[PDB]
Amino acid sequence: GITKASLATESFISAASFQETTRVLTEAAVAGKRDELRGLKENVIVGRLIPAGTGYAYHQDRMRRRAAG
Amino acid sequence: VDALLDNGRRGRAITGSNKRPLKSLADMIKGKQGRFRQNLLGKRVDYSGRSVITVGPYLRLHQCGLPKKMALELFKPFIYGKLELRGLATTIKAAKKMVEREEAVVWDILDEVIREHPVLLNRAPTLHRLGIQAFEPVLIEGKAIQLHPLVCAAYNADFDGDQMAVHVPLTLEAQLEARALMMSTNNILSPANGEPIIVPSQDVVLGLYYMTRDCVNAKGEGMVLTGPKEAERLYRSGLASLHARVKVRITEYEKDANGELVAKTSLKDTTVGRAILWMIVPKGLPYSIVNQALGKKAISKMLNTCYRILGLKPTVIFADQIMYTGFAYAARSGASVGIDDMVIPEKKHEIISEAEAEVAEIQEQFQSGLVTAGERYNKVIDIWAAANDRVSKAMMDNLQTETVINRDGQEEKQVSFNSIYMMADSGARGSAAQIRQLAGMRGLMAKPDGSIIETPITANFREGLNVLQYFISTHGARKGLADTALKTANSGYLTRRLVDVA
Amino acid sequence: GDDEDSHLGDFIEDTTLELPLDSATTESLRAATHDVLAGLTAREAKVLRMR
Amino acid sequence: EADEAYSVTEQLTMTGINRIRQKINAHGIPVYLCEACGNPIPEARRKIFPGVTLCVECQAYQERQRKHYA
Amino acid sequence: YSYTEKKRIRKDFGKRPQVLDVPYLLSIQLDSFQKFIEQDPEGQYGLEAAFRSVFPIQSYSGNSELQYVSYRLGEPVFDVQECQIRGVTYSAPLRVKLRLVIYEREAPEGTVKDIKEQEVYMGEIPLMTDNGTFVINGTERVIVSQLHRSPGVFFDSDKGKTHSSGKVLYNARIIPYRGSWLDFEFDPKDNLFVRIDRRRKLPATIILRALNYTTEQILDLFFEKVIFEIRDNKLQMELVPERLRGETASFDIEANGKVYVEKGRRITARHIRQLEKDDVKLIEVPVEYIAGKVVAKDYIDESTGELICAANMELSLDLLAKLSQSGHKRIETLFTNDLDHGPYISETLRVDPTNDRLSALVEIYRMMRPGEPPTREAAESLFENLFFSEDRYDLSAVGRMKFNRSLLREEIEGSGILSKDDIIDVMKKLIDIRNGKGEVDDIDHLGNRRIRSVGEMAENQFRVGLVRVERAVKERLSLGDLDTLMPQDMINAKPISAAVKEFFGSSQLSQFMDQNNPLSEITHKRRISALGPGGLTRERAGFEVRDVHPTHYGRVCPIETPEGPNIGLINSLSVYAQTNEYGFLETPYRKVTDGVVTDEIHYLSAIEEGNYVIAQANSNLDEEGHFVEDLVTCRSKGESSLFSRDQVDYMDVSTQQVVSVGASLIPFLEHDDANRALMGANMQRQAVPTLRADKPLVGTGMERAVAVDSGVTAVAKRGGVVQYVDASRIVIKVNEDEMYPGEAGIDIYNLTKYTRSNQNTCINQMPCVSLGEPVERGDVLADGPSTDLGELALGQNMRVAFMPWNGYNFEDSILVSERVVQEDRFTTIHIQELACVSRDTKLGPEEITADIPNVGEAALSKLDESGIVYIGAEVTGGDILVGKVTPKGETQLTPEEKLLRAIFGEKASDVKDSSLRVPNGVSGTVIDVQVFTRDGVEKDKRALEIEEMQLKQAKKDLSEELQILEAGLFSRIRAVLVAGGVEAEKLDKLPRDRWLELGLTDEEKQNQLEQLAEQYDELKHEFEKKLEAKRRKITQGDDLAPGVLKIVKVYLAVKRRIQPGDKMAGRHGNKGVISKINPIEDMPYDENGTPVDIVLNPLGVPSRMNIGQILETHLGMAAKGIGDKINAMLKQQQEVAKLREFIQRAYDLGADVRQKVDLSTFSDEEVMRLAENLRKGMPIATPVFDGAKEAEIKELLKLGDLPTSGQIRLYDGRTGEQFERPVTVGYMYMLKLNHLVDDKMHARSTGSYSLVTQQPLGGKAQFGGQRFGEMEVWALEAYGAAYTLQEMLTVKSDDVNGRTKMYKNIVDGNHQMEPGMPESFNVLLKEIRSLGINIELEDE
């Protein structure tokens, strides 16, 4: 169901937006979770270019620079 | 420590001398919902403002009316810049004093910085991407925003005093983003259903309808004219009636070749109104599309075909012309509404006494035990429910055609030209449903329960209602407002869940 | 008021901040002084820049 | 605005009444034996309601029973 | 016909006669408060009542008792006007007489001594104004009457949704006026439960044990006894011939030598008729029927003295033998039947963990306060205090009444707390409904909703004031020494005055008066709310209570309710409604005895009304007053149908009584869709008062009642003649009949002149009578704002015509001719209050000096030597109202600033500029300056000039009184001296002061001259003291806050015309925002050339089914027609004959109306003045449901010589050519609401930023930028607007570094952004990092 499907998100920053914040961080801090941004919600949070539209160009061009040399 | 980190997972340490519990670190991140900062709202934002919105039909669809006072304060750093760029100010501190002084020299500067610089207009509940749209600003004396009427549909703006906000695209990117993506003219199709959302609304369609409509006999009957140009010439000077049957030479086009425009000229059988109108329609459309009566329904399919044949650019400027003309002739028409416009059927009192006797039949049967009690309720409710359909489609037969008028010979009848009908038939406002409450009786009402009451409103709005009839109408009315007040909260929640999962 | 998540602290404005219109003119006051001291004699510049 | 609120009310009212209206059907024709218990159906019920299958006794009873459980 | 009616008489359509004229509309507010504060020598609600409850207070059994004598109300510290300016609350000191008695040890009681301490002070309690408001801090407030669930017991459902079984449930609730709730509720298992308050559910029988009921008395009480005899061997049974109904035979049931029924045949009417008629008392049975029966009492073994069976224990075929062989002849059992008397209470006992009294009392104590140990003394006391203490519990009288009412008792008053019987009787009645006998209540019925208002709610807040002082008094009276402390030492003031100040200050029910409009005030004071303390909550209920209930007919308005988040949660009081003796809502009716309709009226409460059959408002009765038809439409028990001529017991009073004051002010309401009607009376109250008080051409009749009953107008106290008329004051020389014997004199009405309202509108009174005109008592003496000639004029009507005008009325937008703004007629006067404060900061004191660093004389022109703007100076944005400077020394300026100071020689000051300046864009005239100075700081120059001027004016005012009052009084002395010594010319030669000496021969006239002397010398001395106190109050130190030295308040009078953006609407819910203001050249005109003022869109009328606005327009058209007729004949100077002939024709019109009229009015001097007042148009009245009908409108159009169509042809002012089709033109009364554009319009480039979050923030009213919430972000996300979004929540807001980097770039002419990271997120990283969490930014 939509409400259940959305509840699972890769970005932990996105989850602390709409899920219960105390639980999200706790569950995530013990795990040593690394958030790579990638999604929309989180990039708005951290105030950089949305990884779609005009920004898709940039994120794509920068995502490939990663895992590289 | 625990009260410092997350107070509430204990006994709830209260603040000094103050009954309220003190807000902890955890309570400083958490909220409703989640992080307050990213939740609406949402962060206040520089370079912005708002006021009441008004009309301005003189606008092109790609612009909007922005108060002098607002534009001065909004673009203040730009004016300080352009002012010292052209050398009218020694320094920024002088520019500050200049626009503060409102020296007349600055107005001419502001018009420079305003030209190719879109602004964003946004109205109350932002529902789809068309809830924010980009316009080119036109300076206005007054403190209200002027909003192009065709965009009113997308915003779901009426003018009962709603206000809109403005936003200045600062960066060069934001201007080109707002110009190639958010501009009014770039978004004329709804993203929900490929159909135009910039359909002509109400005043403007009632305009065209009255124009491209015909009556049996009037000034100009039967003459023939060289082309559309001289059809207007005939009308503006009071020689011809707007709606009179007329053959005129027209030249339609059809790009039916291999992407190539073919021309066709014919003596089409039309009216003066439809002749004049063709002067707007661009090139490749057929004259058939304006040959009809043009209601709100037919008027939007026209815009649609224009898009899917000529493309974005021609449709935009076309759509402007439609609005401008519809408004103009609407004023010329002098359509109005008085008490005598709401014609009651001559048979009304009859229909009542008949269905009133029908209850008297089923009543006799209830008292004599032929029918049961719950039965009798559902019996009476049908014989009333029927009579309402009789009263409705009685006036609608009378109202629709009963303008009976003559052409040279004997007698003839046609679709009525009664004011209140033209409104519904065209689609400008009101429907035979609502009309049914003005002339015919207005239904039966039901209390909030839903259990519909066994003595309908036998009166209508042109007549008075009496004490009880109004009091019964109350329930349905109040629950109506009550419901749609909550139906505001419910819409909001469904869309929110959907973007979270998308 | 409103019981709303409008809290007292949300209205306490920052008074130590420097508004741009002033940060703007200060960047521009240097410009004017600099050009005024070069349009002088080189001794009057070293003399004035020093006092 | 507000106009829609009125609009909402009309749609609701219409739907409720319509359901009720249907629960009577139309031009029916049939026999006279009650399907529940065989009691005599008078031609009055046949001519008031076209297609009646429940005697006046059963056309209460059941109605009555539904009320009780409410 | 009266005196201010003779001036202008509204032509009234409508046939039904007024039988009862509208009572004081502010009845509710004024009445209730008068009851609270008043000596009542008995218990009826009041301050006396509250006292008598808690008092007498007695020390901890130490026999040191403090009893309550009586109380007094000191005079108001400031009167109404005084208290407002300064900012005190309008209150009176409460002085209560207390008597402290002491009993000897040890005493057969009686006193060593008692000191009868005079009236200790316990705070000041606010007082209500003459017009039903309070003043809390110089600001008028209203206390909204509340609607809450009546005290008593109410049986409810919770059908359906419960558990998804259907089944239904039934619950009872005992709701007392004060004290804990007692809830009784069932469940699916049919177990009875109780919960105190909303607490933990508990097994219901526990309270019986707490009342010292053991198991045996619970069975005996709630159950019958089935007596089992052991006669011979093995078991007989007492049979009640009825017990077997709703059961089937259990065995071979036989008696009386005849087998009536054998095993397996259900006991019905046959078997019970046999048993009852044949008298079957005893039957023989098997030992197995008691296998299920429950034994009633306790039975022990007579030999071993041990317990065989405990009460409420089920027997078995083996258990019987153990108590049968012990010699027990009786075994009492329970009668259990799941249709009639269900085994409910039996099952409950089996769920109870307690057994004895202290056992249950513990389980109650441990439920209420878990976690702490129970005690014997604790558990016993707790329960006795819950429902049986006079102090901690009370149902009141109303609670006791509905309690007894709902339980079918006789007493209408009784115990104030619950008894062992009370609780049991309720549990009894609850069971009955579950059995099928009886129905449940509903919360919504107005017989179960009660109305409280200010008088009651203050009482309750005073009661709590004492209970928190009572603990303190009892505490002091414990240790108090002998004859040293007295009843003032213990009673503090702050604790009492705080508990009452709390209410009137901040409460959901104490709010700023909605005062832009006499209707707005009057509609607010008559208002209900089910919210707040003791009522429902918006998140609680729940559509049933919001919806309009049938019982609302004539009590609550169905149409006047707010349109927001609380619809139906407010409602407005109906016109004729009044509050029941018991505090319910009743409404007036007419007693129909047999078939005649009487005029004796009866008030029927919501419960009373249901029973009777009430006729209808619109019902035709003639001659003696028989019903004309043999059958009349009436409503009786919740429904409405046709009824017989002589079955009707009552009839509606008026056609109006169902609506509110707001709703009744809509004309042709009958023709308006109910929804739009709501918006109508909703927006009518938002009408800002106009410059020139118009008058509605189309009215309803109520406008005079609302104007007068609302305080805004000045209504004559006593009838007489006018001595002096000033724009300032009015003096009335009283007629002899109404004039009191002594002090003689005249009534002098001082008028309210131009002054600030709560909503910044202007409230100004004007004289509506001329010099030497006759006025009678209860006449209109002066119009308020938005009242004309005694009628309520919330706006100005104008010539309106429905037609599309080139789109400048697209949605509901409005198109207005220049003639309106030129005529200054929708121009509106606003008064803002701007204040300047001299504070104390750490660095030093602020001075109000006019020495301001770096400002030219251009500024200091409008400023006096002292630094305050002059009165009368027309100023605009930026002009300085009050010069002010704050200490900020050693700036530490920079090189280039230093070099600049040295080049141009400015003495870089050690003081900051803090002066009060005029907000940008708003511009008006200064009309008043006030200065409040700390007690003991020296009044500066201007401050001393003012307090000197206030003195000279006040002396002139008081003396003016004496001069008029002397001459008025001396003028009476002259006339009584003439009755038995008349020397007309001889008397008035000598000095008037030298008159008091002349006496009179033996008669009462000698004693009458004696009376005027007393009250003369009293005027002489009461003048003196009234002047003295006035003088002290001016010079006395005005007391301020901590840190503040002195304050300057400047009052501005801005005159705002009307411009695109302003919201306007007619009374029929037709909103619209003026869109363009057109030249008179371009307006639609008719063949007579007269342009039209407003061009409305015809499309707005069909959809929104408000058809009354059209009727209004047509009737308005005809009403102006009569105007245009008289104006011609009055300019023709035709003479009384031709004029009066025409006027007389208008006021009859067709026949059958209610109006009546001349020629009685004195056929000359009086008739001509009327004609004048009508030439602007003839005021007509369409009562709410008694309104005018099309025929009467068309008929009045004929007389006006105007077309019946209501439509004419028009010509476009631009092209000059005709408009096809006739268009409607006419006159529609229209309001300008105070959503005026130049209040809504805000803009900000760069402004203040919040400290905590570097985020745009409103600080100097250059307000914060627009908020860009979540949904607006999805907007940009749906476009590609990636940069537009970044900039939106980076540099445009949150980026402390970016915003300045941008602004610098903007002026350099480089559109870029150097964004970086929002501080909002920067704080989260730190906020997270300050928890135990290591949150980093990785990589690169």
Ligand SMILES: [Mg+2]
């Ligand atoms: Mg709106």
Ligand SMILES: [Zn+2]
């Ligand atoms: Zn049957």
